[PDB]
């Protein structure tokens, strides 16, 4: 009862990696951009919907994004402190 | 090798042992991935019920039961079913 070096391990495909969309605000970076997301939620106690925005920054190696533009997001690898979000494709520019 | 444990809860003078399939690395009461029943001797029948299908799937996937668990499985006939020697033997004394 022999057998080659072929007792492998388990498999795992690739699933859902976070996707989102937002507006670019600061272009004074070099091949990096910060984006803000608009989301709506209701207070757990008040019952009044809430519209607050968080701060995020994406990746671009060429900087085709201008101030005040809408973009989509995909979570890439951690590349710098506080920055891991990477732009997928531009939706509009102004 | 995840082994078939008997999770314990409750108080002192009446211990409880739920049948849990889990890794022996964690605490004796630690993470329970899948529960298939419980075991308690305080009651005289100490009735025990086993889900044959889940027990068999765990055995075929790589979980080796502890000796008392295997003995109780033979009692319930699940060991007999898995071995295929005598077949499936039902002799459990359902509580009066």
């Amino acid at each position: 009862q022999k057998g080659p070096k072929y007792t492998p391990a388990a498999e795992k495909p690739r699933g859902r990696r976070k996707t989102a969309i937002g507006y670019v605000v600061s272009d004074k970076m070099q091949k990096t951009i910060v984006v803000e997301l608009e989301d709506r939620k209701s207070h757990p106690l008040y019952g009044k919907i809430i519209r607050t925005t968080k701060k995020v920054k994406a990746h671009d190696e060429n900087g085709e994004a201008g101030i005040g533009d809408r973009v989509s997001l995909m979570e890439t690898r951690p590349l710098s402190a506080t920055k891991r979000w990477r732009l997928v494709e531009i939706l509009e520019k102004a | 090798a995840v082994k078939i444990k008997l999770t314990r809860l409750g108080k002192i003078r009446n211990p409880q042992y739920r049948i849990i399939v889990a890794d022996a690395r964690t605490r004796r009461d630690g993470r329970a991935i899948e529960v298939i029943g419980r075991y308690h001797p305080k009651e005289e029948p100490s009735l025990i019920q086993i889900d044959s299908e889940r027990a068999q799937y765990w055995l075929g996937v790589g979980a080796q039961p502890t000796e008392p668990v295997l003995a109780l499985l033979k009692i319930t006939g699940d060991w007999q079913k898995f071995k295929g020697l005598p077949g499936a033997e039902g002799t459990l004394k359902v509580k009066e």
């Binding site: 207070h43 008040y46 009044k48 | -």
Partner: protein, 122 residues
Amino acid sequence: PTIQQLVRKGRRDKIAKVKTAALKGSPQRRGVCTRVYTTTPKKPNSALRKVARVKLTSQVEVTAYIPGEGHNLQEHSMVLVRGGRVKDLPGVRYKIIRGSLDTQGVKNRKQARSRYGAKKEK
């Protein structure tokens, strides 16, 4: 208050006016008497009550009220203190249980015996 003001400021609940500062949240503190003297209640009620100044394990100087009728307390007597307001005495906010440590319940008590710490008849 409009909804935006509510979100902006948050609603603040009352801050509790904590009473009985001495026990600092405890149901009991043990102390030693420093003095025994008397004081005169406010104008509506006039009398001659007995109050004791005690040192606490929590290092706080607060008077305590002496229950019952007779007492065996002389300066430097370890005592037990509980929580309770007193209106006749303005600077008094504590009692002194009887029948514990060196403070025994006043003799000749048979009604409400438990409150003052007295044994039965025989």
